[PDB]
Design a binder for this molecule. Structure first.
Ligand code: D4W
Length: 208
């Protein structure tokens, strides 16, 4: 059972903008994804302070970067708050309809694509390098779900019948053929050092 949904008009627009705008500084995608993983880890950390039973799905709060040259994928895994089916469907737990306006308005007002995060829509920068994005997620108050989109104005949601995660978000980037640099160890290492050098959680770059 696969559910297909239309993106909200503004989000669909933002996506085609990211896919069609000639913008060479694509590496900003990683900082945006790691920053979201950090935000998700801050949410579970804060919830765990009041009630410690929130960590009964995993105590480790971390970020893993998993390149795979065989499948042409870069996976960003976090052990953060995760998303419920409703969070996942609701513009991916954000005010993305509202935030898209502010960003598209700013792009006309001098600003460039690298400022996407400042409008809370940094996730869509994944489409600067990915031809398809799969988001596997698990929240404490729901089951495991897989969200997927190759853009084109729609996304799908299904329950994931794959490997249980415990809690957190797995962002699988199915990279475009000309974007395989983001699978190279030295290239990832350089991006993390340049943009994510002060994240408050361990970032592990897996080797092949
Ligand atoms: O790449 C991602 C994308 C999304 C999430 C995520 C899980 C729970 N909330 N969110 C979320 C959603 C939209 C904006 C910011 C955040 Cl933190 C993540 O942890 C990594």
């Amino acid at each position: 059972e696969v559910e297909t949904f239309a993106f909200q008009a503004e989000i669909a627009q933002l996506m085609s903008l990211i896919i069609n705008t000639f913008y060479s500084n694509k590496e900003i995608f990683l900082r945006e994804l790691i920053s979201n993983s950090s935000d998700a880890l801050d949410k579970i950390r804060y919830e765990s302070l009041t009630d410690p039973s929130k960590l009964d799905s995993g105590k480790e709060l971390h970020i893993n970067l998993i390149p795979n040259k065989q499948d042409r994928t870069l996976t960003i895994v976090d052990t953060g708050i995760g998303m419920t089916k409703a969070d996942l469907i609701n513009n991916l737990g954000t005010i993305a309809k509202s935030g898209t306006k502010a960003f598209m308005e700013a792009l006309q007002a001098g600003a460039d694509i690298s400022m996407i995060g400042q409008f809370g829509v940094g996730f869509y920068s994944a489409y600067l390098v990915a031809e398809k994005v799969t988001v596997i997620t698990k929240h404490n108050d729901d089951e495991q779900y897989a969200w997927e989109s190759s853009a084109g104005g729609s996304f799908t949601v299904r329950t994931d019948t794959g490997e249980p995660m415990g809690r957190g978000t797995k962002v699988i980037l199915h990279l475009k053929e000309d974007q395989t640099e983001y699978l190279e160890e030295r290239r990832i290492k350089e991006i993390v050092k340049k943009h994510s050098q002060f994240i408050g959680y361990p970032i592990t770059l897996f080797v092949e």
